[PDB]
A and B are shown apart, each in its own frame.
Chain A
Amino acid sequence: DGPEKNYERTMAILQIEAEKAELRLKELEVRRLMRARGDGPWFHYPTIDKELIDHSPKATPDN
C-alpha cells in the first residue's frame, strides 16, 4: 500500500477511536449523575404502584 492510503486509513481509525473514547468518558459521567440524583432512566429503583390503591368510599368515613 502507498503512504497515502495508510495515512488516510490511519485518520479513519483515529476518528473512530477518538469518538468511542469520548463516549466512554461521557457514559461514566452520566452514570455518576443518575446514581447520585435518581432523575434519569437508570438506577430507577421501583416504588409502589399507585394504581393498587382503592379509592372507594370505605366502611368508615375518616380515611
Chain B
Amino acid sequence: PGIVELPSLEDLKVQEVKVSSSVLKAAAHHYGAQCDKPNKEFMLCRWEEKDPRRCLE
C-alpha cells in the first residue's frame, strides 16, 4: 500500500481561539449569526470531501 500523505506541522499552524467553553457558549448565538458564511463553507467542505486534509484552508 501507499504512504499516507500528511501535512507539515507548519501547514497546520493557526492562531487558536483560547477562550473557555462558557465564553463560547455565551457568544454562541451571535457567533452563529455573524460567522455563518465561512463556517458553512467549512462544513460543506468536510461533508463533501470526507477528508480533513482537504479542508485545512
Contact = CB atoms under 8 A, between A and B. Distances in A.
Interface residues of A, number: 4
Main SS class of interface, B: helix
Contacts, number: 11
Main SS class of interface, A: loop
A63 B46 CA distance: 11
Nearest to B50: A62
Nearest to A61: B46
Interface of A: 57, 61-63
11 contacts: A57-B47, A61-B43, A61-B46, A61-B47, A61-B49, A61-B50, A62-B46, A62-B50, A62-B51, A62-B52, A63-B50
